[PDB]
């Protein structure tokens, strides 16, 4: 679903994810990639290490900058096809939605429905 998963075998991702969680347990490792059909800027770096207290809204501010989004432009995150609340912390998202490789996966779109 994620290009990160096609280029990196599961065992490699999982070993990396376990190590990153051990070294920085107060932080969340995140893979961010554009959702299919999204009409929006490409992201230059996909792998992030974020404070667990960072909110989804603060992460939006950071991602919007990197993709050069205008003030009128919408940005939406999806984790397992669900839009997380902008007030949620990245740690809350990680607990409920991390994958078996110990990464949290976020798709982003200009559309409020994933893959629309």
């Amino acid at each position: 679903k994620f290009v990160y998963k096609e280029e990196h075998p599961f065992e490699k991702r999982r070993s990396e994810g376990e190590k990153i969680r051990k070294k920085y347990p107060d932080r969340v490792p995140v893979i961010v990639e554009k959702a299919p059909k999204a009409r929006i800027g490409d992201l230059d770096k996909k792998k992030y290490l974020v404070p667990s207290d960072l909110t989804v809204g603060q992460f939006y501010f950071l991602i919007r900058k990197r993709i050069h989004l205008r003030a009128e432009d919408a940005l939406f995150f999806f984790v397992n096809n669900v839009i997380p609340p902008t007030s949620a912390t990245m740690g809350q998202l990680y607990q409920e939605h991390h994958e078996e490789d110990f990464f949290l996966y976020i798709a982003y779109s200009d559309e409020s429905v994933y893959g629309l």
Binding site: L49, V50, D53, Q58, L62
Partner: peptide
């Protein structure tokens, strides 16, 4: 360009971007 205030490149992995704890103050 070098990122320092809100983000920084991971020293070991140029491919992991580290968001600083100061980014938790953003509004």
């Amino acid at each position: 360009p070098v990122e320092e205030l809100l983000t920084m490149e991971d020293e070991g992995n140029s491919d992991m971007l580290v968001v600083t704890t100061k980014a938790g103050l953003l509004e």
